[PDB]
Ligand SMILES: Nc1ccccc1OCc1ccccc1
């Protein structure tokens with residue numbers, strides 16, 4: 001169980017103006033800190049956000065949040081469930097801003113909703129420094145789905161925040177799970193929704209990526225293969241046949257030739273975008289998310305599991321014999337890897 005803390009600065013808020021927060025379980029014998037960003041799609045205009053407020057309200061408000069949450073997967077404290085970081089300080093940051101963690105705009109007489117994802121992350125970091133984060137050696141910013149894209153947009157800002165506050169010895173790193181998407185052609189007839197959302201949210205993207213693509217084109221920085229080369233912090237990417245990617249591509253699974261080629265080309269393109277990413281784990285499976293699932297230990301690429309690959313990453317940041325960090329499947333069809341989830 002991680003315990004809820006609502007933010008002391010009550011001007012940093014969920015969509016509806018209620019306080020944002022975080023769930024914490026401390027481990028005083030450890031200098032490692034794991035901050036996990038929840039996902040859950042997004043909303044991009046007044047009518048679409050009103051719909052979400054009716055039937056997905058925990059993703060827009062803290063009013064009904066429980067006082068505790070169970071840590072699962074990489075957030076478990078049990079070595080059998082979490083071979084990687086079972087002894088770490090654990091933080092779960094709920095997603096209540098509907099802005100893929102990019103916003104910095106308050107509720108006002110002009111704005112029915114507040115979109116403060118980027119500021120929520122900053123304020124969680126700032127309040128944690130008083131509860132032990134000041135003594136950390138490593139801060140791992142992790143996240144799944146919209147939270148995985150949120151890692152890519154925020155990891156370098158966290159590094160900058162800690163340097164300017166006077167903690168230059170804390171090593172900031174990122175782990176982006178199921179947040180690496182392609183702006184490809186649909187199978188039957190996305191970038192428009194992000195382009196509209198960014199204006200609706202006052203969304204912010206990393207500075208080097210913003211300077212490459214310039215005004216009006218910041219939406220490009222929500223796509224992993226375009227924003228990742230601009231990042232300075234070390235980032236491990238977990239992603240080949242992602243179900244959210246296929247949903248936006250209008251693919252629903254006796255497969256004819258046209259769809260067979262479409263699916264095989266998608267896997268080849270994903271593989272291509274990861275060729276020059278040295279810390280990555282990309283199995284040939286149809287699935288979505290992995291790192292907070294209890295059975296995240298079962299899947300393997302080339303004989304190496306995800307917890308092992310992350311441990312090898314840690315060792316590399318002190319090539320390694322028998323402990324690889326770049327693991328991408330080469331076979332071309334979903335589930336050609338025998339260890340894919342059932
Ligand atoms: N909405 C969004 C949010 C984050 C990153 C990209 C995004 O574009 C939409 C999208 C395109 C392809 C596959 C999945 C989603």
Ligand SMILES: *[C@@H]1O[C@H](CO)[C@@H](O)[C@H](O)[C@H]1NC(C)=O
Pocket residue numbers: 009011012119
């Ligand atoms: C509370 O958060 C807001 C938004 O980031 C900021 O303007 C303000 O400085 C914060 N308050 C304090 C006391 O730090």
